[PDB]
């Protein structure tokens, strides 16, 4: 689990969005596994606007942060799950690092701010949904 709180927005994995997220929907994209809902309180986070390919992510299944080198956002095949049919997930960055299903929502940060959230993984990989291109989160 986990979310990004920026301005009056809450960014979550679309597959973990709550009834309240859907009732306050701003934007969602199944191909990216992202959903953004509106909030009444001002958020605590800021978003990176950069091309970093290294950073640190929070891994809830280890209660620890780990450093990673990750690929640039791209279209990657993701096998069927209980949440989605077999499809290509867009804006996805892969890295070598531990992850388990419940680790979705962990934040990836570089020195500039939040880069994205855990969205896929397994067998020693961890995949992050990028949010750096969503410029409207800042206004
Ligand atoms: C951190 S995810 C993970 C980690 C380890 C293992 Br084994 C397996 C997973 C994958 C997983 O649980 N899902 C369910 C959530 C949907 C997601 C998606 N973005 O389409 C991909 C599939
Ligand atoms: Zn950066």
Co-location of 71 and 14 in the same domain: no
Which parts of the chain fold into alpha helices (H)? 19-23
Co-location of 49 and 30 in the same domain: no
Co-location of 25 and 72 in the same domain: no
Co-location of 54 and 22 in the same domain: no
Q: How was this structure determined?
A: X-ray
Is 52 marked as binding a ligand?
yes
In angstroms, rounded to a whole number, what is the distance separating the alpha carbons of residues 104 and 100? 8
- The count of other CB atoms within 10 Å of the CB of residue 54 is 12
* Whether residue 122 has its Cβ less than 6 Å from ligand 1: yes
Residues 6+ apart with CB under 8 A from 4: 10, 11, 12, 43, 45, 47, 107, 114, 117, 131
Co-location of 67 and 123 in the same domain: yes
In angstroms, rounded to a whole number, what is the distance separating the alpha carbons of residues 72 and 92? 8
Co-location of 64 and 93 in the same domain: yes
Domain that holds residue 8: 3-44
Residue with tokens 């306050």: 24
In angstroms, rounded to a whole number, what is the distance separating the alpha carbons of residues 9 and 41? 9
Which tokens belong to 45?
A: 């986070």
Task: Find out whether 54 and 70 touch, Cβ atoms under 8 Å.
Answer: yes
Domains held by the chain: number: 2
Co-location of 137 and 85 in the same domain: yes
Co-location of 78 and 115 in the same domain: yes
Co-location of 49 and 110 in the same domain: yes
* Whether residue 76 has its Cβ less than 6 Å from ligand 1: no
- Cα 40 to chain centroid, rounded: 22
Residues assigned a catalytic role = 15, 33, 104
Q: Resolution (in Å) of the shown entry?
A: 1.4
Query: What residues are neighbours of ligand 2 (ion), with CB under 5 Å?
Result: 48, 50, 52, 110, 112
């Amino acid at each position: 689990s986990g979310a990004i709180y920026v301005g009056n927005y809450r960014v979550v994995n679309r597959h973990l969005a709550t009834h309240n997220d859907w009732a306050n929907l701003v934007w969602e994209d199944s191909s990216r596994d992202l959903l953004v809902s509106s909030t009444t309180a001002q958020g605590c986070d800021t978003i990176a606007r950069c091309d970093c390919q290294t950073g640190v992510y929070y891994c809830s299944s280890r209660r620890k942060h780990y450093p990673v080198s990750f690929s640039k956002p791209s279209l990657i095949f993701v096998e069927a799950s209980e949440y989605y049919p077999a499809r290509y997930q867009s804006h996805l960055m892969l890295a070598v690092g531990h992850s388990e299903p419940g680790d979705c929502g962990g934040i990836l940060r570089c020195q500039h701010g939040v880069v994205g959230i855990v969205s896929t993984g397994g067998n020693g990989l961890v995949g992050f949904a990028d949010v750096r291109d969503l410029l409207w989160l800042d206004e």
